[model samples]
Target chain A: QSKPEDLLKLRQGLMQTLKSQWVPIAGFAAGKADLPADAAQRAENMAMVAKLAPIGWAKGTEALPNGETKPEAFGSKSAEFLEGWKALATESTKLAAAAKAGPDALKAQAAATGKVCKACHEEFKQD
Target chain B: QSKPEDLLKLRQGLMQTLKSQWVPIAGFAAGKADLPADAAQRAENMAMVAKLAPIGWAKGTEALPNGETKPEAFGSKSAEFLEGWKALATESTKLAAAAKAGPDALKAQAAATGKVCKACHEEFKQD
Candidate 1:
């Protein structure tokens, strides 16, 4: 079963995910404004964000309560309770770590991780 | 006395705060890179983010558990327990909103919000 503490971690994790996404995006945007002779750095940063997305999803969902816990425990569907949430958390971390490089990494990170959130909301959110 | 639902709102509010801070920042950065001579829009965007910061903080912290709650419930010092968190959340919104008007607004937002986080960690967080 997921604890409130788990929720706390999830909240913090979400904050980190938001930060990771922006960090690279902002860098690349800055580079674009500055007009460095080349845009490869920004491109690379975007690519890094892409790589980190799925990896972060994997780690983030580890604690999502499966049906094994009391039905009331998770407040909703038991079958896939934590399944997606864990995936989100895991991929987000990977997204952050992997996107650490390149100028636009923050933007890339944001784009990459946002999809996971969309996925979770579609599949798991109660309403 | 705050309720657990308040905590839920707090978490959601934090999520909103993180997102608002980055949106304008990213917009400004992109303008800089694109070298849109009309960096005005980006600048304006950043200023918007800055204005939002303190407003967000105020709304977000409104639910923080004051010592008025069961002393044991808050997990730390009563005088200071939610005081810093409330302040951080309130100021963060204004900061984000205020920075939406300039080239470096996003970067500025990042720095300002980072301080709020640090302040809370230092002043209210107990080991």
Candidate 2:
């Protein structure tokens, strides 16, 4: 809700957290990296990812340049894309809970969440 | 280190972590908010701040637009600016240690780290 005129920058921040904090930590469950060795930190990163992801498409944010997000992200083409992003955000929250159960659940959920990212990109994003 | 063509995006990720993860957690030590109730998570976030701060000005990132970072960040005037960022990064690392001592120590270190942000902005960042 903090719609600073710099919404693009704020959105960029969300992606940054995704890459640096979320992805690396999530990678551990996915067997990608060993970073965020601390259990609590890993959970926190997952929570951060859930909290940050949905904001990627905040109201005015679809207008930014250099991002792969497409125009359909804003107008009539938005429904499925928006829903996919929302689902990604929702699924990400489950990671911390899944992590508590064990690596397999976490790994499964991490992959599931990643699938959402890929799916949306395939449908909406441009390279 | 990754140096994807999306370096600007990566830098934005760093700032997002600062804004969304670091600032709010630092806020607790400074008596601003209390969301990261887990002590370990707090420490982890501070450690993350240390890891992330300097990456804001990674090589090839100075050419981006819509950021406050000035050209001096990459040119002859860069020494002082870089030093200020380095100091902030160093100070942020200490916050995790200070948190182990108590809220007071954490508060002091958090304020110290913030000063580095302000100092660099004062000297090098443009509106």
Candidate 3:
């Protein structure tokens, strides 16, 4: 297992990606942001983050002592969160694939992935 | 300007991307890892990180009270580090492009980008 500090760093790093990379592009896709209009760039952004979607539940990351990660992340209540986590990974992968298909496909699937993101955070995150 | 704590999170979040995303992909590009051998994935990873390379010197990040970001990151010696930062962004972008060309191009460019990463850490970051 990694150190608690490293785990915290990983968690925050994922959050950063969500904020810096995911949110902006997703915003653009949803007609919220005025930039990142390139579809290929949008796909690349989501695909990279899709690869990292399961990191919050990585084997050594659950027990970390810092940040808003709740005990349910690693305890008896983990199953629901894990399901949500898998859904995120799956949905993001579909979004990535839809992005490859075309902008219309990406726009159609984006909100589905976003809903999964919101659900996981609401159930598992503290802040 | 953001708060010191938010800035700290941003800085640490950037480092997390370096450690978790960049390092492994670079390792595989250098033939160090057995996974992440997909060339497109490698390119995508570097390009995404390249987009974030200069974030360390983002307009409001300097002078934060935590982490290993040395005072020079925002102080009188900032130019040298900013040069290193831009070099990092440029080289990683090159690496991303090279990844699209072929595996051989990627391998050659990867080390150059890595050198920029090391140089920035050595000249500006503190333990």
Candidate 4:
């Protein structure tokens, strides 16, 4: 049911090239783009993805095609790795709720969400 | 506000590698994976992205970094191209609503959404 190549591609989609959905939200959070009414939908969707993405962390397949994922994240730090996505789900969920509340709260939650996403990169992904 | 490089990347995200969020739903629609409760969120998120994607069709920038997009769609068929994303937004919105209704409705709407997505690829994207 899982192939390393396919897994790698999906992982990329979630955080890589397929990260387009996050683009506008990033812009809005930074005041580059106006927040659309549906931005809440984007945050909710991303939270949903956080739940499914851990499957891409399959063992022994680290960095086969993409070099940014640290191999140790798959082994000794796997629990911590899993928790990153878990935290993202919670943070993004908060973002969605804030988005529904309107701009001021959205900015605060978006900042929190961005911090959570970066935390994952600092710990699990390589520069 | 529009950089050719950034626009290309965003276009790729909406329909290309960044399309990982759709993977599981595609599987569910094809009976490959069980439907997850958050699928409605996925569909809604995709719909929101659809509204933001047309800006990626900036003039003369077709295929700068990626070659799959056809140049003609940016000019002669521009209205039609815009219509494609518009349609995707609507189709995805329907998918979201159906997803909330549960599996049977979700499957029906997902097939319709898939058909709408393919119609764009068939006309606007190169094989």
lDDT head-to-head 1 vs 2, winner: 2
Residue-by-residue lDDT tens digits, candidate 3, A1-127 = 3467866765676566555546655776678765445544544544555555555456667666756767787787777876775676577667667767766787788778788778877877888
Across B41-104, the per-residue lDDT of candidate 1 in tens digits comes to 3333333333322222232344454312233224445446445555555555555455445446
Per-prediction count of colliding residue pairs? 67, 1, 0, 1
Alpha carbon lDDT of each predicted model: 0.42, 0.62, 0.65, 0.72
Model 3 chain A worst lDDT run, 10 consecutive residues: A35-44
User: Residue-wise lDDT of candidate 3 within B1-127, one digit each (tens)?
Assistant: 3456765765676566556656665776668775355555544555555565555456666666775777777777878866775676677677667777876777788777788778877877787
Q: Candidate 2 — which residues are off by over 4 angstroms? A: A1-127, B1-9, B29-36, B49-55
- On lDDT, the leading prediction is 4
Looking at model 4, give its docking quality level. Answer: incorrect
Q: Once superposed on the true structure, which residue ranges of model 1 sit more than 4 Å away at CA?
A: A1-127, B1-76
Q: Could you tell me the fnat of model 1?
A: 0.00
Position B53, candidate 2: lDDT: 53
Clashing pairs in 3: none
Question: What lDDT does candidate 4 reach at residue B77?
Answer: 86
For candidate 3, the per-residue lDDT at A14 reads: 54
Q: Compute DockQ for each candidate against the true complex.
A: 0.02, 0.17, 0.25, 0.12
Kindly list the per-residue Cα lDDT of model 2 for residues B41-79, writing each as its tens digit: 544554455444555575667776666677887887878
Relative to the unseen true structure, what is the C-alpha lDDT of residue A60 in candidate 4, on a scale of 0 to 100? Answer: 49
| RMSD values, in order shown | 19.1, 9.5, 7.1, 6.2
